[PDB]
Scaffold this active site. Sequence first.
Site, mmCIF file in Angstrom:
data_model
loop_
_atom_site.group_PDB
_atom_site.id
_atom_site.type_symbol
_atom_site.label_atom_id
_atom_site.label_comp_id
_atom_site.label_asym_id
_atom_site.label_seq_id
_atom_site.Cartn_x
_atom_site.Cartn_y
_atom_site.Cartn_z
ATOM 1 N N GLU A 4 0.800 -1.196 0.000
ATOM 2 C CA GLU A 4 0.000 0.000 0.000
ATOM 3 C C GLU A 4 0.842 1.259 0.000
ATOM 4 O O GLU A 4 1.721 1.386 0.766
ATOM 5 C CB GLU A 4 -0.900 -0.015 1.271
ATOM 6 C CG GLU A 4 -1.757 1.204 1.573
ATOM 7 C CD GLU A 4 -2.607 1.080 2.780
ATOM 8 O OE1 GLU A 4 -2.575 0.077 3.544
ATOM 9 O OE2 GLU A 4 -3.313 2.123 3.107
ATOM 10 N N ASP A 52 0.333 5.025 0.746
ATOM 11 C CA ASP A 52 -0.559 6.102 1.223
ATOM 12 C C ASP A 52 0.038 7.400 0.753
ATOM 13 O O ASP A 52 0.786 8.025 1.499
ATOM 14 C CB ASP A 52 -0.738 5.993 2.741
ATOM 15 C CG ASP A 52 -1.491 4.735 3.112
ATOM 16 O OD1 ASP A 52 -2.451 4.410 2.418
ATOM 17 O OD2 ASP A 52 -1.057 3.978 4.032
ATOM 18 N N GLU A 72 -3.015 10.814 3.513
ATOM 19 C CA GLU A 72 -3.951 10.567 4.680
ATOM 20 C C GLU A 72 -3.995 11.877 5.454
ATOM 21 O O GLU A 72 -2.943 12.390 5.876
ATOM 22 C CB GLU A 72 -3.457 9.488 5.504
ATOM 23 C CG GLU A 72 -3.632 8.169 4.731
ATOM 24 C CD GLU A 72 -3.282 6.954 5.554
ATOM 25 O OE1 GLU A 72 -2.003 6.763 5.783
ATOM 26 O OE2 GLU A 72 -4.256 6.229 6.049
ATOM 27 N N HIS A 130 3.972 1.377 2.610
ATOM 28 C CA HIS A 130 3.843 0.147 3.456
ATOM 29 C C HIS A 130 4.193 -1.036 2.625
ATOM 30 O O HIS A 130 3.380 -1.554 1.866
ATOM 31 C CB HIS A 130 2.372 0.001 3.941
ATOM 32 C CG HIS A 130 1.844 1.029 4.849
ATOM 33 N ND1 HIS A 130 1.701 0.853 6.209
ATOM 34 C CD2 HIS A 130 1.290 2.252 4.566
ATOM 35 C CE1 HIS A 130 1.162 1.953 6.745
ATOM 36 N NE2 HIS A 130 0.898 2.800 5.756
#
Length: 432
Positions: free
Chosen positions: A212, A214, A217, A228
């Site tokens: 993932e 991001d 956020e 991640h």
Amino acid sequence: QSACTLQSETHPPLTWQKCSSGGTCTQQTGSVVIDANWRWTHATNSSTNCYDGNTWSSTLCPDNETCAKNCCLDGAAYASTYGVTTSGNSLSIGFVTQSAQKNVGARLYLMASDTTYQEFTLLGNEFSFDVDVSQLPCGLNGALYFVSMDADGGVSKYPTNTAGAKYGTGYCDSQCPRDLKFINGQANVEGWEPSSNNANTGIGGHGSCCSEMDIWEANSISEALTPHPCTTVGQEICEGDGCGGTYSDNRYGGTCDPDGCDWNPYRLGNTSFYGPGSSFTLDTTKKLTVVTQFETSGAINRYYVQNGVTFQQPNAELGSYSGNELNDDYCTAEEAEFGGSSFSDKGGLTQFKKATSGGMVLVMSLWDDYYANMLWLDSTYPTNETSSTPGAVRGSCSTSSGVPAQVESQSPNAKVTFSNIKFGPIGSTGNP
Ligand SMILES: *[C@@H]1O[C@H](CO)[C@@H](O)[C@H](O)[C@H]1NC(C)=O
Ligand SMILES: [Sm+3]
């Protein structure tokens, strides 16, 4: 699961720009689809619910295979049920929408056609979008991110899923989510534990893990950029507590890094960079452009535009690191200064390059946090620490303002608006 058509499914259209190194951008016509977990799941030949509240039908869904045979996902009324609308190149996601039932937020994927997700190869490329976070208080997260999901929603790998990407199947992320009702073409009713604090959700015996990125956020108070890595790059089922992630008793107990190598300017000491009003460099009361470049070394570069003025990511000094790029030196210094080892245990930015050199799906969402109340984003965290602990303060929010019952009652009409998505080779998203 299969698909049913008691409610027709019409994916809200959304345009975006594909840019070229030749100095131009070309408009693309896509659409968005809501994730399958938001949908009404009912019997294939009647309106009888397979799932209602936070529990499953014992007779339709005695086990994971029987349930998938007996049940179907239906269409979504995007605006009236979910508070989701699109307007040209803009996507608005509302927070609480009360109809016959309470809806909270939404998770949406960008499509390439009626039955396939758009896949992006991030490495060597750049992604730009605009965002209005003004209506996102403490406790919320308007998220724009990428996961290593299958383009078809899993239909080819798990042919008992006949609903597919058209109905938003196939989700995975680095939290290895176990709240999903269908994983790998089976239900997740086996071991289902209704949430004590959420009448609409629970935790099943399986989860769905993958890499993932991001990109964003954020709320009006804080923002973070976080890769991640996972030991298996793409989608993989996990079992029970072996999952790790947010939905297991030991978050650090599985195949994905649930914390990531995050860059939050507030956390790094730059407390006047991003926030509401004129005392911040980026004023979160107004729309902002966020640009993210995936350098071929594996590093990540970030700059911002607001009212025509460009700002590079601010410099940080942490340990022996000094710079403004999310790179191996940063991630090593971060673990040394702030603690943690899940990022490097999972292979760091070198493992993460496996994900960004492959295809990833664009996800846009709005959520509150029934597990950690978004304190990791915008408050002092972990909550057994203090402001003196290095890295503990990530924003100015109080501990209690991100409790879902509070935020849902006080700020139901919170919303995020994403717009003007541009993607292409590094240096191209400013093209006409
Ligand atoms: C925060 O970043 C802005 C933009 O780079 C800069 O002008 C300001 O000096 C920074 N403050 C700190 C404490 O680093
Ligand atoms: Sm660089």
